[PDB]
Design a protein around this ligand. Structure first.
Ligand SMILES: [Cl-]
Ligand SMILES: [Cl-]
Ligand SMILES: [Cl-]
Ligand SMILES: [Cl-]
Ligand SMILES: [Cl-]
Ligand SMILES: [Cl-]
Ligand SMILES: [Cl-]
Ligand SMILES: [Cl-]
Ligand SMILES: [Cl-]
Ligand SMILES: [Cl-]
Ligand SMILES: [Cl-]
Ligand SMILES: [Cl-]
Length: 247
């Protein structure tokens, strides 16, 4: 059963965290399931299985904090608070942009396919769908919409993103599990290990260094709620308002 996370996160906890995603007011009702999450996680053994018990729970809280924001349907004064509205969407609302970078040569854009955000991490662009597909043994470049029709695949794309360094960025996994050693240049950029660097990895060019404080605070609000629920310390350097984005 190693790699099965059901011993440290229960259905009760999963659906309490995501208490509105199955509400009629959300847009992917019944799509994201606890079983789909557990199955996806088995494909990435070290996810949720690195460190002591508290570290394992912290990683789960961080992953759900970030993916909850990517998928949020929250608003100011939402029932039970905006930090209860994660997983309200399974794909990007605006589907008009193919997100094709034709200058990349390894991952050709398939005709008529769109690489807009899908899944918990809102995976985007041919240059992410390509290597993700390669790594999962799936044809995601040719069939990107499987990432929004199969919940196991949807979660796998999100965990893949979480586990995968993309130079110069380390993996989110490495940051949250105290396995990332910042370079002297990272230190000069204010990028000290914590949830803040994770926000920076995901969308720092548009949100960090004070560029979108509201979005960053939303990411923090989910994470702190989830940490409180698991009873774990969220760690230091939770914000990224004094970090420079990665280059
Ligand atoms: Cl259960
Ligand atoms: Cl419904
Ligand atoms: Cl792994
Ligand atoms: Cl295994
Ligand atoms: Cl373990
Ligand atoms: Cl938003
Ligand atoms: Cl809504
Ligand atoms: Cl609120
Ligand atoms: Cl949706
Ligand atoms: Cl498509
Ligand atoms: Cl520090
Ligand atoms: Cl937001």
């Amino acid at each position: 059963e190693f790699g099965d996370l059901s011993g440290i996160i229960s259905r009760d906890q999963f659906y309490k965290m995501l208490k509105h995603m199955n509400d009629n007011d959300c847009h992917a009702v019944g799509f994201f399931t606890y079983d789909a999450f557990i199955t996806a996680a088995k494909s990435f053994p070290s996810f949720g299985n690195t460190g002591d018990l508290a570290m394992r729970k912290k990683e789960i809280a961080a992953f759900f904090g970030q993916t909850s924001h990517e998928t949020t349907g929250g608003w100011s004064g939402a029932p039970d608070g905006a930090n209860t509205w994660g997983y309200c969407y399974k794909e990007e609302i605006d589907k008009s942009d193919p997100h094709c970078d034709s200058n990349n040569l390894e991952w050709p854009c398939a005709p008529g396919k769109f690489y807009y955000g899908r899944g918990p991490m809102m995976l985007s662009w041919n240059y992410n769908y390509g290597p993700c597909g390669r790594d999962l043994g799936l044809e995601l470049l040719k069939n990107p919409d499987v990432a929004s029709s199969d919940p196991v695949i949807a979660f796998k794309t999100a965990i893949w993103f979480w586990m995968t360094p993309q130079a110069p960025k380390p993996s989110c996994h490495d940051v949250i599990t105290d396995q990332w050693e910042p370079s002297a240049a990272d230190i000069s950029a204010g990028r000290l290990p914590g949830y803040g660097v994770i926000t920076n990895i995901i969308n720092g060019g548009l949100e960090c260094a004070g560029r979108d404080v509201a979005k960053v605070q939303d990411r923090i609000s989910f994470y702190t709620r989830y940490c409180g629920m698991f009873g774990v310390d969220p760690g230091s350097n939770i914000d990224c308002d004094n970090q420079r984005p990665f280059n």
